[PDB]
Amino acid sequence: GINSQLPPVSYIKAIDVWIGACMTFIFCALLEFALVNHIANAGTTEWNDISKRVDLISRALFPVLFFVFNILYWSRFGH
Amino acid sequence: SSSLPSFQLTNTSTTYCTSVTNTGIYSCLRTTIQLKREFSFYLLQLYIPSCMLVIVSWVSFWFDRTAIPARVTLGVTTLLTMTAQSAGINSQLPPVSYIKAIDVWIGACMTFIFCALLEFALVNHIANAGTTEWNDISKRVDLISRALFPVLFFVFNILYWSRFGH
Numbered sequence: 018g019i020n021s022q023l024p025p026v027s028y029i030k031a032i033d034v035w036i037g038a039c040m041t042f043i044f045c046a047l048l049e050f051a052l053v054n055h056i057a058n059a060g061t062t063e064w065n066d067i068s069k070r071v072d073l074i075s076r077a078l079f080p081v082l083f084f085v086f087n088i089l090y091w092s093r094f095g096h
Numbered sequence: 097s098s099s100l101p102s103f104q105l106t107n108t109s110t111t112y113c114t115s116v117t118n119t120g121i122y123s124c125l126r127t128t129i130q131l132k133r134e135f136s137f138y139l140l141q142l143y144i145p146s147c148m149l150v151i152v153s154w155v156s157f158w159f160d161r162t163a164i165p166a167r168v169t170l171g172v173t174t175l176l177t178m179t180a181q182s183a184g185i186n187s188q189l190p191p192v193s194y195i196k197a198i199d200v201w202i203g204a205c206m207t208f209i210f211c212a213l214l215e216f217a218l219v220n221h222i223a224n225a226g227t228t229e230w231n232d233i234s235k236r237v238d239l240i241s242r243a244l245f246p247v248l249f250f251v252f253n254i255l256y257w258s259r260f261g262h
């Protein structure tokens with residue numbers, strides 16, 4: 018919906034960056050669950066502890082990394 | 097060079113184009129400009145998104161056969177998404193009636209997800225048989241596709257860019 022209203026140009030606009038970013042953060046989010054499900058299937062007690070660990074990390078990792086990008090993005094395009 | 101909206105001017109050239117026509121021989125000057133596009137934009141807008149989608153279609157192979165809701169949803173959503181992705185792209189390409197390179201690269205990703213959704217159908221079909229041997233074949237198909245698809249895509253990737261890097 019966004020892409021089909023931006024004036025046609027053939028160089029990377031700032032919004033185009035911010036779109037691909039969100040596209041990545043959701044791609045990684047859907048990817049994170051795939052890793053968790055993969056290691057959780059193992060019956061060993063250690064792998065279960067790692068599966069739970071990956072979740073607990075991402076619970077606060079992603080909001081941090083996005084906030085990092087958030088800072089980087091606006092500072093780059095706040096001129 | 098900056099002024100141009102959609103193209104980037106690389107080169108200029110002053111040559112002669114004096115030719116001989118039915119009416120006679122007329123002297124002629126031809127100035128020429130060379131426009132090529134920024135690969136950067138089209139890479140981020142068109143190519144990279146679909147690369148993520150093809151990768152997503154692969155992670156259904158790393159899920160076991162028993163999780164039917166997992167691999168069905170992954171397979172059908174990825175295909176729906178690609179059709180939408182292709183729709184957003186297709187409705188901004190300048191109207192032409194010959195196969196563009198991007199158009200090839202779209203139909204390819206469309207196929208790799210069609211085959212991914214198809215792979216699970218094969219696995220689910222042979223896994224229903226109670227025999228332990230079919231089960232080992234069911235599990236084998238998964239383990240292959242886990243590394244088969246990324247290879248075949250990487251093969252196509254090589255072929256594609258080499259064909260369209262001229």
Ligand SMILES: *[C@@H]1O[C@H](CO)[C@@H](O)[C@H](O)[C@H]1NC(C)=O
Nearest residue numbers: 106107108109110111130132
């Ligand atoms: C640009 O034009 C010059 C002059 O003819 C030529 O020597 C050069 O090869 C051209 N460059 C490209 C991009 O081919």
